[PDB]
PDB file of N, CA and C in Angstrom:
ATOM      1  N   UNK A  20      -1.794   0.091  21.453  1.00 15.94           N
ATOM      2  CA  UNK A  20      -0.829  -0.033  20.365  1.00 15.94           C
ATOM      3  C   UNK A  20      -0.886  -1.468  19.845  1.00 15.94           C
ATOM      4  N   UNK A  21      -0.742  -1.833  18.415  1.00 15.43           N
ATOM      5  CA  UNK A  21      -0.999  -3.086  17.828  1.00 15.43           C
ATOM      6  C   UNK A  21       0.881  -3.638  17.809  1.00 15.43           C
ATOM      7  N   UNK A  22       0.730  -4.490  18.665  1.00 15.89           N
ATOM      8  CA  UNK A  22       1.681  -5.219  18.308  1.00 15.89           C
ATOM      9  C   UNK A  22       1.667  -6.780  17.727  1.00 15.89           C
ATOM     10  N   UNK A  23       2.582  -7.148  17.187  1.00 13.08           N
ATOM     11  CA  UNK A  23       2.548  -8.833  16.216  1.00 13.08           C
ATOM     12  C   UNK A  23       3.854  -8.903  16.893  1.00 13.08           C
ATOM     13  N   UNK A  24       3.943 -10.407  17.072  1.00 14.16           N
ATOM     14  CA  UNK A  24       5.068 -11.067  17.472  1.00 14.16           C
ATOM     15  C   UNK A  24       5.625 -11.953  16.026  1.00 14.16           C
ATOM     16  N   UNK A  25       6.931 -11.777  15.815  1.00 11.81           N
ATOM     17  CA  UNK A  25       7.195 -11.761  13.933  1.00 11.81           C
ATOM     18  C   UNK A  25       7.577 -13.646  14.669  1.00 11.81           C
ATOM     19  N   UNK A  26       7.461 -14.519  13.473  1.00 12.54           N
ATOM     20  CA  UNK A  26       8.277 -16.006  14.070  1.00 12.54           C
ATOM     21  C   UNK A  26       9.493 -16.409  13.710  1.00 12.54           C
ATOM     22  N   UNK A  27       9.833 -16.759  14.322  1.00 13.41           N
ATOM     23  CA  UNK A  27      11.632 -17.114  14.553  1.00 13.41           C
ATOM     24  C   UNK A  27      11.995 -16.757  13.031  1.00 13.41           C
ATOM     25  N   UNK A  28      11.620 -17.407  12.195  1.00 15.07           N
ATOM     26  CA  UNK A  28      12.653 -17.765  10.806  1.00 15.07           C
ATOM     27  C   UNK A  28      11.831 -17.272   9.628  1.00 15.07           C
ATOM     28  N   UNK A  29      10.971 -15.983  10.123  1.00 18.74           N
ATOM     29  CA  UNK A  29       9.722 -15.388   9.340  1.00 18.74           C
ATOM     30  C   UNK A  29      10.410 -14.033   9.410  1.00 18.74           C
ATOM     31  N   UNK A  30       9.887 -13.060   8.633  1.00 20.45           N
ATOM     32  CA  UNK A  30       9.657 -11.781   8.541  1.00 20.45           C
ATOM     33  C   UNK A  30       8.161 -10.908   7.953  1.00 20.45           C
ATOM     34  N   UNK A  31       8.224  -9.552   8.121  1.00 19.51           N
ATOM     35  CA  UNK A  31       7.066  -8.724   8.449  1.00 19.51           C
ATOM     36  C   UNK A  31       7.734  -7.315   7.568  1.00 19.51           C
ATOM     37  N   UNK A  32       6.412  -6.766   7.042  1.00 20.93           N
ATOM     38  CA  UNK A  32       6.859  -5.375   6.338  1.00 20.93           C
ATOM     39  C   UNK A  32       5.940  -4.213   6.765  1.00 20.93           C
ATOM     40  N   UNK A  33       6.199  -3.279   7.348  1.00 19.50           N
ATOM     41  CA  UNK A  33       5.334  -2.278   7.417  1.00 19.50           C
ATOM     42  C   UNK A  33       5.625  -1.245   6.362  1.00 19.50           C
ATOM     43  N   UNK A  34       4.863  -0.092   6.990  1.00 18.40           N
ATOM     44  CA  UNK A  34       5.418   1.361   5.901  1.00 18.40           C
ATOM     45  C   UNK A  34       4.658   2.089   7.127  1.00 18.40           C
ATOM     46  N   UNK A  35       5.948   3.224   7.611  1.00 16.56           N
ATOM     47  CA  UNK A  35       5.268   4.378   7.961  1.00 16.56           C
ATOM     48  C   UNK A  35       4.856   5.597   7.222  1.00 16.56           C
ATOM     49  N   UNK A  36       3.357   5.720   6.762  1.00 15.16           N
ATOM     50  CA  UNK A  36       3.516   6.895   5.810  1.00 15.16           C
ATOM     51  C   UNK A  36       3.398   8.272   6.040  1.00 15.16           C
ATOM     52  N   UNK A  37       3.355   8.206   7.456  1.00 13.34           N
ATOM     53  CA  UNK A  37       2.976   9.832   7.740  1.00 13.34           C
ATOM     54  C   UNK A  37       4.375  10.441   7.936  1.00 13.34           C
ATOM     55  N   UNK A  38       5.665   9.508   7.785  1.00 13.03           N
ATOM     56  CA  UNK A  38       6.732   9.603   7.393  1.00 13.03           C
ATOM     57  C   UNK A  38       7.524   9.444   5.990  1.00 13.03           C
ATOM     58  N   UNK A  39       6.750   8.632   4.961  1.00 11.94           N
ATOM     59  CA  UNK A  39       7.263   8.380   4.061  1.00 11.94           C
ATOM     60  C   UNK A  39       8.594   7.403   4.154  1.00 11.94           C
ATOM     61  N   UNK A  40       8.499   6.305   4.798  1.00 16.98           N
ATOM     62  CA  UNK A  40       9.631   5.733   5.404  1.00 16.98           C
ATOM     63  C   UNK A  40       9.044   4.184   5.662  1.00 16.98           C
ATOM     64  N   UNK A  41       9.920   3.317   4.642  1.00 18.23           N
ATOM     65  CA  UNK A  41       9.616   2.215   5.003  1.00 18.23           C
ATOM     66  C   UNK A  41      10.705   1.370   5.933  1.00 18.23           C
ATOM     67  N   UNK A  42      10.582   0.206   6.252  1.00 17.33           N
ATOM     68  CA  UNK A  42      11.359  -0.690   7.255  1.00 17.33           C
ATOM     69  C   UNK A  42      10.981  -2.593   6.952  1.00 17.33           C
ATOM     70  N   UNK A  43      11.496  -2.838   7.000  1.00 17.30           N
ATOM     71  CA  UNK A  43      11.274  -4.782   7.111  1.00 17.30           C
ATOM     72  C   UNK A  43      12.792  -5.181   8.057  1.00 17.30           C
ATOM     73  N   UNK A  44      11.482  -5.805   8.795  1.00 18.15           N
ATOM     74  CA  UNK A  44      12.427  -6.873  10.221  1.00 18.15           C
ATOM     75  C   UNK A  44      11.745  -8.062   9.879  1.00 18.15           C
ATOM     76  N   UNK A  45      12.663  -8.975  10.509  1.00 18.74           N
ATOM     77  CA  UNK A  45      12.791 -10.268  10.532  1.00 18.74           C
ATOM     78  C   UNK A  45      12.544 -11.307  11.946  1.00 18.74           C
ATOM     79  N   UNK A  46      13.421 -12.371  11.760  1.00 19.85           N
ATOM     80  CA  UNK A  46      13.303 -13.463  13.207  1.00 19.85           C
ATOM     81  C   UNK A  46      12.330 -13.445  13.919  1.00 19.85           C
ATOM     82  N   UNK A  47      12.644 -13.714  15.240  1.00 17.67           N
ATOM     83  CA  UNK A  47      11.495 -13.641  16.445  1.00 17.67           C
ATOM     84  C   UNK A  47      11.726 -12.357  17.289  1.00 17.67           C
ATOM     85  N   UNK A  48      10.823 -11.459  16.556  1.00 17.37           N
ATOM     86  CA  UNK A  48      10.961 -10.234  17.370  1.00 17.37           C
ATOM     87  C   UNK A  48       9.270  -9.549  17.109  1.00 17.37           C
ATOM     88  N   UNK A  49       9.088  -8.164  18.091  1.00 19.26           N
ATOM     89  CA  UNK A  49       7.676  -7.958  18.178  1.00 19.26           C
ATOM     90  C   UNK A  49       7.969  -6.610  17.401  1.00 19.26           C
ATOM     91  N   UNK A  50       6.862  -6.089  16.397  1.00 20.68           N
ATOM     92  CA  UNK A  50       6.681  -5.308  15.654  1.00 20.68           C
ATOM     93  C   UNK A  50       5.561  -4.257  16.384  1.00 20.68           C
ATOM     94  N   UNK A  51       6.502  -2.832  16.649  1.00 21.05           N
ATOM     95  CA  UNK A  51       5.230  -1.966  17.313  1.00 21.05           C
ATOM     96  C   UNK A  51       4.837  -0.875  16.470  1.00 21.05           C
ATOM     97  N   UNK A  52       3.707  -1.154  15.907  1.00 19.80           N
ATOM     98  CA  UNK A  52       3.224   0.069  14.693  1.00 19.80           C
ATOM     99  C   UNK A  52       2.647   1.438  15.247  1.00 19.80           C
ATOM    100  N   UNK A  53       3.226   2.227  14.605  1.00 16.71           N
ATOM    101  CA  UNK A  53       3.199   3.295  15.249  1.00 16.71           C
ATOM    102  C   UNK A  53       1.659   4.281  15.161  1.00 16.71           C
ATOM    103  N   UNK A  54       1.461   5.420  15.060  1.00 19.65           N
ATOM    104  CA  UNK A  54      -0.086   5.603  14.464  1.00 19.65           C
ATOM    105  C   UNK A  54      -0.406   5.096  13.369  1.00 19.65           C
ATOM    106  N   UNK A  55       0.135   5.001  12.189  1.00 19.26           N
ATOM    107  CA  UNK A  55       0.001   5.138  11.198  1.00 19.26           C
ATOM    108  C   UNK A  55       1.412   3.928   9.696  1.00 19.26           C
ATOM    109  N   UNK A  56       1.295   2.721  10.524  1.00 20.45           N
ATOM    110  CA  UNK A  56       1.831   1.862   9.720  1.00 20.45           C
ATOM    111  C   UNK A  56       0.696   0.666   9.682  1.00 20.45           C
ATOM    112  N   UNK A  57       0.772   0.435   8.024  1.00 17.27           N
ATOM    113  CA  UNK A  57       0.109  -0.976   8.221  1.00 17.27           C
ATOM    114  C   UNK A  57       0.700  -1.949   7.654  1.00 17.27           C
ATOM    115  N   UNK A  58       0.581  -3.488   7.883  1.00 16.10           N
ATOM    116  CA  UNK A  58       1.328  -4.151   7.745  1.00 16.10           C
ATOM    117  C   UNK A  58       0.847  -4.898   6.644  1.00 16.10           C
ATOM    118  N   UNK A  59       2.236  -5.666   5.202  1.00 19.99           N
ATOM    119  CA  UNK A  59       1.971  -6.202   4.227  1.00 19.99           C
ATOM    120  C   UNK A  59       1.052  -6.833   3.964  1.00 19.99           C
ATOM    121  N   UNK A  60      -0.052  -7.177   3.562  1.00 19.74           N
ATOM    122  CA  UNK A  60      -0.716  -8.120   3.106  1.00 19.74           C
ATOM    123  C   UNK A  60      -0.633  -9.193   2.296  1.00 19.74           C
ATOM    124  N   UNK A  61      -0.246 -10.073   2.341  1.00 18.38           N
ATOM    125  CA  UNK A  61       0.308 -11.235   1.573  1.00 18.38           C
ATOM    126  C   UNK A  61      -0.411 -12.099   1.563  1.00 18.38           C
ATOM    127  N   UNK A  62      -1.114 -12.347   0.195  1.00 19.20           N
ATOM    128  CA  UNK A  62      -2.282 -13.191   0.033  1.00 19.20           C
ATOM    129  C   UNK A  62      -1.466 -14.474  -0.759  1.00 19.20           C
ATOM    130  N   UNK A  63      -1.106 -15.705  -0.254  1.00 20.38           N
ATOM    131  CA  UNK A  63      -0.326 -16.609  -0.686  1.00 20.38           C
ATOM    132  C   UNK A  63      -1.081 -17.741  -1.181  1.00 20.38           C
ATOM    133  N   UNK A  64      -0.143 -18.823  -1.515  1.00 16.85           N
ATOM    134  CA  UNK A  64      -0.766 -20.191  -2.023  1.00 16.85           C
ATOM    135  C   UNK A  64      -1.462 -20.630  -1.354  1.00 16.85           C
ATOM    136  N   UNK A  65      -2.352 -21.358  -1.282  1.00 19.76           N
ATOM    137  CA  UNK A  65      -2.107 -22.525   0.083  1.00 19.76           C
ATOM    138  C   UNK A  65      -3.510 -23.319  -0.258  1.00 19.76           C
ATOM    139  N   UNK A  66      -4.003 -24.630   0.533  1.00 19.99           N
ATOM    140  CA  UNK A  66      -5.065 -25.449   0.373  1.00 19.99           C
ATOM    141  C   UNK A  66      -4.970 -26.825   0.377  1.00 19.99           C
ATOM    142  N   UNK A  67      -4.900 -27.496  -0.909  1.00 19.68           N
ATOM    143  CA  UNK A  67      -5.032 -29.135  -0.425  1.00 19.68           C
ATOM    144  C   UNK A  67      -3.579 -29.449  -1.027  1.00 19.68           C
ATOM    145  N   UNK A  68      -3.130 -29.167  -2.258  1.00 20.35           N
ATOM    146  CA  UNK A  68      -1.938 -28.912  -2.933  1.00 20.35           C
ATOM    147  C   UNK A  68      -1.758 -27.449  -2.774  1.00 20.35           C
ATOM    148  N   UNK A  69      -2.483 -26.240  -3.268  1.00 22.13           N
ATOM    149  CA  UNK A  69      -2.413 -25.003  -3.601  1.00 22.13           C
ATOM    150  C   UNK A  69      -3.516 -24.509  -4.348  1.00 22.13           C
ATOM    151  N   UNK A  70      -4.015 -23.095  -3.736  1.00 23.21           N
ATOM    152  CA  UNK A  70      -4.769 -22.769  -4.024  1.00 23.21           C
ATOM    153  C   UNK A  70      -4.406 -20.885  -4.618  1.00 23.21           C
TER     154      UNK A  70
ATOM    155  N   UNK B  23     -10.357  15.396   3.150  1.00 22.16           N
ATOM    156  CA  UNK B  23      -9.743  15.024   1.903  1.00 22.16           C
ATOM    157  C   UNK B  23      -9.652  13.837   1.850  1.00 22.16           C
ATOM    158  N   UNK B  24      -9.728  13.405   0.535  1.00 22.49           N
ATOM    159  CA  UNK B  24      -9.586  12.028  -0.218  1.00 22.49           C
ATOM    160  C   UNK B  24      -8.165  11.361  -0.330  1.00 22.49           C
ATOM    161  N   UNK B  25      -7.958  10.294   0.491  1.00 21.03           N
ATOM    162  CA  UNK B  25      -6.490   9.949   0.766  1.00 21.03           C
ATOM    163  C   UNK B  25      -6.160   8.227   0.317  1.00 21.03           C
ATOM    164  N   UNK B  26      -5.496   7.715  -1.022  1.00 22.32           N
ATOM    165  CA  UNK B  26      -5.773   6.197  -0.928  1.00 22.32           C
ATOM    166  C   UNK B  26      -4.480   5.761  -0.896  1.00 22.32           C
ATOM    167  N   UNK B  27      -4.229   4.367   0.361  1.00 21.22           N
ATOM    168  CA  UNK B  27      -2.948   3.936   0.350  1.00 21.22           C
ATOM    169  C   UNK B  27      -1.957   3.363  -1.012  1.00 21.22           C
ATOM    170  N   UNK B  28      -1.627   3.876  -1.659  1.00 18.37           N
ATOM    171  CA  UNK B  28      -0.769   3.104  -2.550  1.00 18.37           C
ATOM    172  C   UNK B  28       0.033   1.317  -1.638  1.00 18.37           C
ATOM    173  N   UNK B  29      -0.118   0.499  -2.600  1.00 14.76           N
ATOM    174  CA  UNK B  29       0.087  -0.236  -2.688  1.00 14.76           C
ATOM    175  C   UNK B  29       1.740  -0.653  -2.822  1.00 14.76           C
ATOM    176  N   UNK B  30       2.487  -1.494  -2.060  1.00 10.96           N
ATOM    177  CA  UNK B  30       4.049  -1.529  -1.884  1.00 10.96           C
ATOM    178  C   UNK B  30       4.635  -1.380  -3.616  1.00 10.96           C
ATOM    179  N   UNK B  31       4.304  -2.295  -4.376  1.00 13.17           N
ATOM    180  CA  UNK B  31       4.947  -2.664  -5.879  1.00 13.17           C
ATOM    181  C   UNK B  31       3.918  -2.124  -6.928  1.00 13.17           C
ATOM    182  N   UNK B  32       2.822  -1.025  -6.789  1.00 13.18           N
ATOM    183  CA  UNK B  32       1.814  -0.499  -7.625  1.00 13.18           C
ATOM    184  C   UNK B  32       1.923   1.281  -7.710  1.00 13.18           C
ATOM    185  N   UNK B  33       1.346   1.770  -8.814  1.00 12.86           N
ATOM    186  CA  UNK B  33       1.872   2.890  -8.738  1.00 12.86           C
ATOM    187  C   UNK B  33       0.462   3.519  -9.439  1.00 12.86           C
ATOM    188  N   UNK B  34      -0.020   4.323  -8.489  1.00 12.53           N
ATOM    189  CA  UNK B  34      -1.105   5.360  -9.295  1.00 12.53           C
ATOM    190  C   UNK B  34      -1.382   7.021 -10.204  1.00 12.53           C
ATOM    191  N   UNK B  35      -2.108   7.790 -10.988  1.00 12.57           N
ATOM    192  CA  UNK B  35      -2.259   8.668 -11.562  1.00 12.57           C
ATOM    193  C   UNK B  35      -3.047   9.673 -11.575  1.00 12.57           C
ATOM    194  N   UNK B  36      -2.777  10.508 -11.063  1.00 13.57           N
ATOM    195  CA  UNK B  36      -4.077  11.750 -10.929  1.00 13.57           C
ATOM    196  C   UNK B  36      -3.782  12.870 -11.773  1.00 13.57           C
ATOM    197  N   UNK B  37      -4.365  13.731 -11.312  1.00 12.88           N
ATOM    198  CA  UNK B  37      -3.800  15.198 -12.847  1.00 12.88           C
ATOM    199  C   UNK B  37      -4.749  16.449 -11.460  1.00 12.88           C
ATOM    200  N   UNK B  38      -4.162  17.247 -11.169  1.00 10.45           N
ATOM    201  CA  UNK B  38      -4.330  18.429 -11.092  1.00 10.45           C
ATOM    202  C   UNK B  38      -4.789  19.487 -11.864  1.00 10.45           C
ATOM    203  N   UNK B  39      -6.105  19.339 -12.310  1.00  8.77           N
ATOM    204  CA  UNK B  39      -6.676  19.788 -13.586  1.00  8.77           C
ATOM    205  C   UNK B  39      -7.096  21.252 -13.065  1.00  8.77           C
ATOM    206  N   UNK B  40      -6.762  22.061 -12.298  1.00 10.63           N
ATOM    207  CA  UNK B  40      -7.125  23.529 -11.816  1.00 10.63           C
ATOM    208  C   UNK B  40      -5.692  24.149 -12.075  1.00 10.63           C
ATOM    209  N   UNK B  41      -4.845  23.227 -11.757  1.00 10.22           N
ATOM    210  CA  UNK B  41      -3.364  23.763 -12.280  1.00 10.22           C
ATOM    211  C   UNK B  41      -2.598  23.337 -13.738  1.00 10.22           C
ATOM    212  N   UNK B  42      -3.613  22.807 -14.174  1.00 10.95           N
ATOM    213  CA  UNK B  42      -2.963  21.734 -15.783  1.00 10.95           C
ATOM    214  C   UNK B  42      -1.842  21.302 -15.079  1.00 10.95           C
ATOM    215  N   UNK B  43      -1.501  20.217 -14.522  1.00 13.86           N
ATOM    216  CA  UNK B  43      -0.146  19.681 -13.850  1.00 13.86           C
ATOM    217  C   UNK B  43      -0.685  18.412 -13.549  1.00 13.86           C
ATOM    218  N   UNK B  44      -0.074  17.405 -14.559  1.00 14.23           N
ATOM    219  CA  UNK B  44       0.129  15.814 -13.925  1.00 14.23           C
ATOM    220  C   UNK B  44       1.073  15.123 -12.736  1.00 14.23           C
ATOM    221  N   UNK B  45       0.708  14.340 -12.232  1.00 15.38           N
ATOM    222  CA  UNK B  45       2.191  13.674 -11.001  1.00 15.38           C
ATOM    223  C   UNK B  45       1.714  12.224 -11.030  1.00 15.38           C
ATOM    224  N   UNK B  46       2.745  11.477 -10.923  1.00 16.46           N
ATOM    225  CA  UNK B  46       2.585   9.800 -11.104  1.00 16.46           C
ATOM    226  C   UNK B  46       3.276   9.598  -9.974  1.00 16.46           C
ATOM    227  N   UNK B  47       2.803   9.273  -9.114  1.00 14.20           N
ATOM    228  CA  UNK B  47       3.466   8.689  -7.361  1.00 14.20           C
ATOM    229  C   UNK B  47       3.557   6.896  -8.010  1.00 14.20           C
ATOM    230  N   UNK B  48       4.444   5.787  -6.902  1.00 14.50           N
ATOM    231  CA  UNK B  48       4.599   4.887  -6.756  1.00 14.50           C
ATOM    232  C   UNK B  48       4.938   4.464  -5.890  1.00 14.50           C
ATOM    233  N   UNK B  49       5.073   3.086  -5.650  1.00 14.59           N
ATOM    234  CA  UNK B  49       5.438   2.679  -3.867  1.00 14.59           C
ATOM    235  C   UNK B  49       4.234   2.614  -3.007  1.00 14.59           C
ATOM    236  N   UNK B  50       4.499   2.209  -2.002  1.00 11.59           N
ATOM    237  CA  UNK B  50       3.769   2.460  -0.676  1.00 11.59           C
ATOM    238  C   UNK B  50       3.600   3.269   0.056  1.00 11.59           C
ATOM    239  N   UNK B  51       3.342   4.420  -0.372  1.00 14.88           N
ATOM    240  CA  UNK B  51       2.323   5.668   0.152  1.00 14.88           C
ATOM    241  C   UNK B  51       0.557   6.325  -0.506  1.00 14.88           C
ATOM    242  N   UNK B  52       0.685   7.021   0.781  1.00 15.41           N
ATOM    243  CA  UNK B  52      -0.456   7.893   0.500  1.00 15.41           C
ATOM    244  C   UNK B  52      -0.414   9.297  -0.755  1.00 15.41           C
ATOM    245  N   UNK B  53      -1.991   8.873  -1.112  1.00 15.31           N
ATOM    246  CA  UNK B  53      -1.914  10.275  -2.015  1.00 15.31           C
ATOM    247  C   UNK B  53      -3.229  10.935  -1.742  1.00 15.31           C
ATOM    248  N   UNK B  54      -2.448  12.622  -1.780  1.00 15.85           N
ATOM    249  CA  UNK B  54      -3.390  12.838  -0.704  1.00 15.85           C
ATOM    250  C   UNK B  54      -4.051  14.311  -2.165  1.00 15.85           C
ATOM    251  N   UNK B  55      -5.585  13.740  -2.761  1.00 17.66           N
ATOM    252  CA  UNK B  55      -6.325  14.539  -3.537  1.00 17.66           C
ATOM    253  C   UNK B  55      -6.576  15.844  -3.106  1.00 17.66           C
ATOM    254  N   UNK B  56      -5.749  17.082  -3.557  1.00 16.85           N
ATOM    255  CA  UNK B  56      -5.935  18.435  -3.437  1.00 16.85           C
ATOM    256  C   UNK B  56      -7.598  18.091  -4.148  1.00 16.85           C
ATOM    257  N   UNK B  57      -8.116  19.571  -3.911  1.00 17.34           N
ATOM    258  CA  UNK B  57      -9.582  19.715  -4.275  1.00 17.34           C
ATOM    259  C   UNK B  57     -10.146  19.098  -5.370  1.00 17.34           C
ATOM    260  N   UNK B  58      -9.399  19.219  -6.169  1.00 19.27           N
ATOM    261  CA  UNK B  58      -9.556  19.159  -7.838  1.00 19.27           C
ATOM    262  C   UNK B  58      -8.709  17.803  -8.353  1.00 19.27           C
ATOM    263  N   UNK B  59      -8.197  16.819  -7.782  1.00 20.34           N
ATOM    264  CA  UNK B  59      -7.535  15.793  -8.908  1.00 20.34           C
ATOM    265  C   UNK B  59      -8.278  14.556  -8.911  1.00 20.34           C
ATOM    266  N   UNK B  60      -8.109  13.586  -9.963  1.00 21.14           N
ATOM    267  CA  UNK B  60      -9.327  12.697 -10.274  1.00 21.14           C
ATOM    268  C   UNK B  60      -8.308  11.577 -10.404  1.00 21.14           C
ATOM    269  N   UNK B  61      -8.749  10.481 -10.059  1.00 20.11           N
ATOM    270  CA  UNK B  61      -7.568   9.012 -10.125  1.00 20.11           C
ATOM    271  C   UNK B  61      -8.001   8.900 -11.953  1.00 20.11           C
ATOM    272  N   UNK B  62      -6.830   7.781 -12.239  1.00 19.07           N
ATOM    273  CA  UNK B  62      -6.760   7.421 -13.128  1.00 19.07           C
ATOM    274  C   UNK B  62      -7.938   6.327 -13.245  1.00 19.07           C
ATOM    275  N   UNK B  63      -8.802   5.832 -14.132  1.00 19.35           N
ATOM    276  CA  UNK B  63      -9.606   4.819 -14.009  1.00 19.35           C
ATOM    277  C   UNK B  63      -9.045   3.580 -14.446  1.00 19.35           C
ATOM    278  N   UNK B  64      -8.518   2.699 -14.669  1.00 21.14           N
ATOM    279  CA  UNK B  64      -8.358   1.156 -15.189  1.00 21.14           C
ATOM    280  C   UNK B  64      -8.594   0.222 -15.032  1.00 21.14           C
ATOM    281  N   UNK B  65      -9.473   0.059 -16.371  1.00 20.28           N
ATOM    282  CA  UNK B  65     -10.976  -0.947 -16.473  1.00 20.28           C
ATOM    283  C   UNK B  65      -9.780  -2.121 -16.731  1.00 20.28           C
ATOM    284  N   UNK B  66      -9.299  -3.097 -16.421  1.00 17.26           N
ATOM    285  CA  UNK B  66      -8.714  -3.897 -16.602  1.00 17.26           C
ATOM    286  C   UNK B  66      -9.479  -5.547 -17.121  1.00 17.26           C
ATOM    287  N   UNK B  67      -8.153  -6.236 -17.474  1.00 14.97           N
ATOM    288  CA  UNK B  67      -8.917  -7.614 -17.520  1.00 14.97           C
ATOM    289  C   UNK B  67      -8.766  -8.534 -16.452  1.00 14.97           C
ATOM    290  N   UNK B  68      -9.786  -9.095 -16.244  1.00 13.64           N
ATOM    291  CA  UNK B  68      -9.756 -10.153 -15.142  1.00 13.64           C
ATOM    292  C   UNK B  68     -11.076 -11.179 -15.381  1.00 13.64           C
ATOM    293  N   UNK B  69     -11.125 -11.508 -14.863  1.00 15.40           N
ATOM    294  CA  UNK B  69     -12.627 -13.120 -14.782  1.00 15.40           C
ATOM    295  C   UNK B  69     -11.938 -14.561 -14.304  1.00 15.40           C
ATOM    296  N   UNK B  70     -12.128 -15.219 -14.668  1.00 12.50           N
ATOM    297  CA  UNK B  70     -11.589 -16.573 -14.453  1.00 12.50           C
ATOM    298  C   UNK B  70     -10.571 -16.911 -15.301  1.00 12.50           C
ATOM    299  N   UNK B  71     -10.011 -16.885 -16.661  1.00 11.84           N
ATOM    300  CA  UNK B  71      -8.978 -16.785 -17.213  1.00 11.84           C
ATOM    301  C   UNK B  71      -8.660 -15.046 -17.619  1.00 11.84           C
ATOM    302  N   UNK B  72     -10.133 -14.635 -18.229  1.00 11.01           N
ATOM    303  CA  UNK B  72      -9.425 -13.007 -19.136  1.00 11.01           C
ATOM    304  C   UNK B  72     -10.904 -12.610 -18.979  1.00 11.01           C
ATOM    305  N   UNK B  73     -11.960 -11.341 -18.578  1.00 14.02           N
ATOM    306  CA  UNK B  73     -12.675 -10.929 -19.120  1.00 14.02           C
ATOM    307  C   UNK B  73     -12.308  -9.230 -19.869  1.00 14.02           C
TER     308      UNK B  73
END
């Protein structure tokens, strides 16, 4: 089972779809995906200033 | 069968062309192509500013 450990003052989004049922948790807690959730992809800024 | 994750904030188009019947799903799920439906195509713009 894939688990992620979320960080303290962060949050995480899955979607279960073989349920049709989404969820978002937060803080420092561990996220256990079930068969069939995958987790947000968040392609952000980032680099020397921003990229 | 042909199954593509929809995207959390994107929304896709197929048509059921054996039944003449359109459906427009959105959100973050799966869509799951009965025998016969064809995605929407969108040739969009993109390049480095616009192609």
């Amino acid at each position: 089972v894939v688990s992620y450990r979320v960080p303290h003052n962060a949050a995480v989004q899955v979607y279960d779809y073989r349920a049709k049922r989404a969820r978002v948790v937060f803080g420092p807690e561990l996220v256990t995906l079930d068969p069939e959730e995958q987790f947000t992809v968040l392609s952000l800024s980032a680099g020397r200033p921003k990229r």
